[PDB]
């Protein structure tokens, strides 16, 4: 009988989009069965975000989400911090293993509200079908100088693989990552942007805590000879060779998002081998996708917003 | 009670500078006698800011302040809202009455953290010696295009006079304003910056609620022919003919301040008849100033920070 707002005291600082295209700005005492609701398990309550592979998407995306967006925006220079503790309960059980996005779900992001509307960070959990352990990795998308159709993401592994580890054919998978994270296994992230520098921390009991620093005010990617080999390789059949503006996301307004942003869709892999995953979507029927594994589902027990801080 | 943080639940969102030059970042359970403390009166507790006319000033100013500064900064596009209810209990009883800033105290501001470090708004209370009623007015400072030494403030009256109404000699005063606010009389302000537009609301029991709208993204002062007449009298002595850059404070990082920023100092009126007030400051001896009326003291009942909101 609980609402998610009973578990997240800053619920009034978020709006939501659900997998069925519902937008809701006032989330105090709000739930909707099968998308955004509370689940009780032994001694903890969790906020569930559940979304199919193909529901009603936002105008900005081909992928379906049930995900919060922070109402108060900020530029990297003034900063912001998001802390989450969560477990992924389910990712799509179908999709083409040659496509980097298949079988994954983004569980936190910074999204830009203007300009190209790209993401300085998207944190993913990806698990191939049949595997016990999945991978957590995070992607930085360039704030492309000029035409955004040449953009790309650079993916960095936390536990397990990064997004570039694909199967060599549509239904054969790499071996499971030995150091990865199971469904139902708790982990935490913090995204702390202080004075334009994004400091990430990822922790999970029994695994190494892993930290990263990425300056969001000065690009590392301002010419062709700076594009990482990972981009040349993973985007080789797409054609993406953009460069990033010199000052990256300096002064660009953005905001946090958190929940289940499903990156497995039913688009044809031939149209985009990195992001169109060709999964089973049952012609958009949400109840049939839910009955056959064609969805993602992520549970959070803590989601806190605060100000950016100097790492100690 | 004793700590101002028992009255202001958001005390951890502010830092302070006191009139003796003390800076303190963590204000929970913090008070300093004679500067920042709580006074109980009839059935309400108030947070008191008290400052001499000449204490230890910030590097940025010739005036002394005991004043909060908001820790988390913002640009006008993303916005912010400050609400306060207060009463002014004392302004300096000495000063050259010809000088526009004399006998006044700023009780709320937006202050820029970069660039020229100018203020999109400072809210003043000013009361000539011996008057019962003082005036509340607010100043917008241009974000000067080019050299800031040509900057100026434009003052708009709320109740009573604006800053430009001065006495005819150093020691005599204009008539009391018909509509002003007495020492000890409560009034409220709200500075609500939503999508770059500043909406002000001022209210006090038994006076008209007054509202203003000022766009902080698009200057009304881009040509010399737009400089208001007011500036031509006040600033005649001083060389201030600047114009403002076209997009005003767009993208410039700001934050709110609230407290007692005393505008009466001991500087020579013959050097600057707008800001150099020639008051008695007893060689910077704070005790002697407090004993002889050379100070400002403002009590707040409420002080809340929030997001900017669309008016309605
Ligand atoms: Na901001």
TrEMBL record, chains A, B:
GO MF entries: hydrolase activity, hydrolyzing O-glycosyl compounds; poly(beta-D-mannuronate) lyase activity
Cited Gene3D superfamilies: 2.60.120.200
This protein's record includes keyword Lyase: yes
A Gene Ontology BP annotation from the UniProt entry: carbohydrate metabolic process
Domain Alginate lyase: 11-305
Top EC category: lyase
EC number: 4.2.2.3
Keywords, alphabetical: Lyase
Protein name as catalogued: Alginate lyase, family PL7
Species for this entry: Zobellia galactanivorans (strain DSM 12802 / CCUG 47099 / CIP 106680 / NCIMB 13871 / Dsij)
